[PDB]
Design a protein around this ligand. Sequence first.
Ligand code: CXX
Ligand code: CXX
Ligand code: BOG
Ligand code: BOG
Ligand code: BOG
Ligand code: BOG
Ligand code: BOG
Ligand code: NA
Ligand code: NA
Length: 511
Amino acid sequence: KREHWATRLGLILAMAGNAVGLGNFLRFPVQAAENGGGAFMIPYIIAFLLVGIPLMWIEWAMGRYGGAQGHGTTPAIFYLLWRNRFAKILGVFGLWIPLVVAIYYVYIESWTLGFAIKFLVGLVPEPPPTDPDSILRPFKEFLYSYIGVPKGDEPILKPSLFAYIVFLITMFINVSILIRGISKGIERFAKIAMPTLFILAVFLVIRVFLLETPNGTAADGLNFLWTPDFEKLKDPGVWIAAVGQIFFTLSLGFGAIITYASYVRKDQDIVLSGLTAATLNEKAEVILGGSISIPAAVAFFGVANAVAIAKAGAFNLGFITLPAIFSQTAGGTFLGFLWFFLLFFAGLTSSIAIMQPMIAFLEDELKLSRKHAVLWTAAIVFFSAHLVMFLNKSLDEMDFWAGTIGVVFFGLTELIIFFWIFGADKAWEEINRGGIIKVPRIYYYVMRYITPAFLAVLLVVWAREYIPKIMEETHWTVWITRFYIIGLFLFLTFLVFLAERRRNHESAGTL
Ligand SMILES: CN(C)CCCN1c2ccccc2CCc2ccc(Cl)cc21
Ligand SMILES: CN(C)CCCN1c2ccccc2CCc2ccc(Cl)cc21
Ligand SMILES: CCCCCCCCO[C@@H]1O[C@H](CO)[C@@H](O)[C@H](O)[C@H]1O
Ligand SMILES: CCCCCCCCO[C@@H]1O[C@H](CO)[C@@H](O)[C@H](O)[C@H]1O
Ligand SMILES: CCCCCCCCO[C@@H]1O[C@H](CO)[C@@H](O)[C@H](O)[C@H]1O
Ligand SMILES: CCCCCCCCO[C@@H]1O[C@H](CO)[C@@H](O)[C@H](O)[C@H]1O
Ligand SMILES: CCCCCCCCO[C@@H]1O[C@H](CO)[C@@H](O)[C@H](O)[C@H]1O
Ligand code: NA
Ligand code: NA
């Protein structure tokens, strides 16, 4: 009774949409810009080869394996691979991480829809005729008024009425797709969204490549991004940034690739399919995402200033700088619309992917109907999102624990359980089974020894030289978000406990 992807194309575009999202167009540019541009790319490429690709196959394999037995989420799948109560508990992260990411990701996605709407109808700011700030300030105030940045000392946000309603609409749109299921919902939408997304992105790159000012050209932006710095490879922070981006952009460690793969027929290839999805994401990221905002910013403000803007972070580059720059060109407001529409489709195809794990768990383990599973999941995300919408820095806290530390920790966890506990040879066999192509021989040793060792070191260095400076150097309000998401973990563990009991009570009625 489990759904399955209808076509190979659909599967590939759905998986591609899972990966290609806000991380490609917003996160990548910031990470690369603040880490030296080209100096970021070497570790990034290496991370993609030693972590991205191998974990992608591992997650597809685990998902297809679990699906064959009617399970699409990690609490059950981890137990199938390691029959130990602790496997179910660690598996909870496969529901918690995607749920927590969704709680702030859908909200950011809603901003892009709201901006798309306002830019389409021309309800945007109008700067004067060369001073930077005189042009950027109006756009900064525009964003600040939208999300309600604090004007006082209280760490409280005051979202505009329009932003709140657009978030509601955004949740509604995510639900309209998810409620139709895998083949008729997610797959059908991906076939529409991905082509649209690709065309919009190419057009924007072309337009940005035409940008030129007394300060530079788009070419200067590209040179900054693709010019190596072999003297930065010794910087740990750059590696942590690169690996973190690889996980986020490929949706690895979210339990999302696994859940999507659980709808792939038991015999269907995952080697070539997985590699293709990963390659598509990388193209969209380094070629499309990398060629839009960085080159535009560099062309208008020069490299030094572009970098400063990125380090200023706070969504400056994508929500303030790029539109401000576009406003200086004929048809620039429409150009802004295209940008935000692109971001919206990129985010939407990814948010449905990160919400599906909770949906699958409720359907697979608690036996809820798809309708009910989708509605309760949306309700939980909608409610919880109020924390991100009203408490300044809550978004940052969730993105750190789930979207940064969480995904890397879970990636290592799933690899250990699948390639070490379940059995390296059994895992290798499982990955290659039905493959249109075989995984290169060398990757067996990468998956069994290199990847885990690489991640283990990363995490160690991370928790010893970086985390401490946060667990003690933040406003007391970070504890509100920490308290809440720990509660979410507790609640999800309770649900796994209930699924466990329903299972036994149902098994007893069978014997
Ligand atoms: C209401 N639907 C009959 C219209 C079909 C188009 N559609 C779509 C396409 C594939 C799968 C699900 C959905 C339903 C919701 C939705 C939302 C936004 C857009 Cl941009 C298209 C879109
Ligand atoms: C610093 N914070 C204000 C933002 C944190 C979240 N964020 C994020 C999260 C989900 C989707 C898009 C983006 C875009 C901006 C960005 C840039 C770098 C990092 Cl590492 C995180 C990051
Ligand atoms: C069911 C959970 C309810 C949580 C309380 C939500 C209160 C939202 O309240 C609304 O917030 C909007 C954005 O700031 C404002 O524009 C509206 O005027 C305000 O009524
Ligand atoms: C896509 C549909 C969006 C509907 C929300 C529009 C929010 C526009 O703006 C709102 O308009 C209201 C009057 O209609 C005013 O009372 C509010 O003060 C104003 O912020
Ligand atoms: C942890 C998340 C808590 C969300 C509770 C939000 C309660 C909303 O509170 C309301 O917000 C409006 C707009 O900001 C204000 O105009 C109202 O005076 C205020 O009561
Ligand atoms: C983390 C929780 C954030 C909640 C945001 C609440 C925003 C509501 O706004 C607050 O309402 C209070 C009345 O109760 C007033 O005394 C405050 O001055 C006002 O800023
Ligand atoms: C560190 C990860 C490197 C990945 C690059 C793999 C390139 C594939 O390498 C090729 O694999 C084939 C099948 O195993 C072999 O028959 C070829 O001799 C070998 O060159
Ligand atoms: Na991505
Ligand atoms: Na996406």
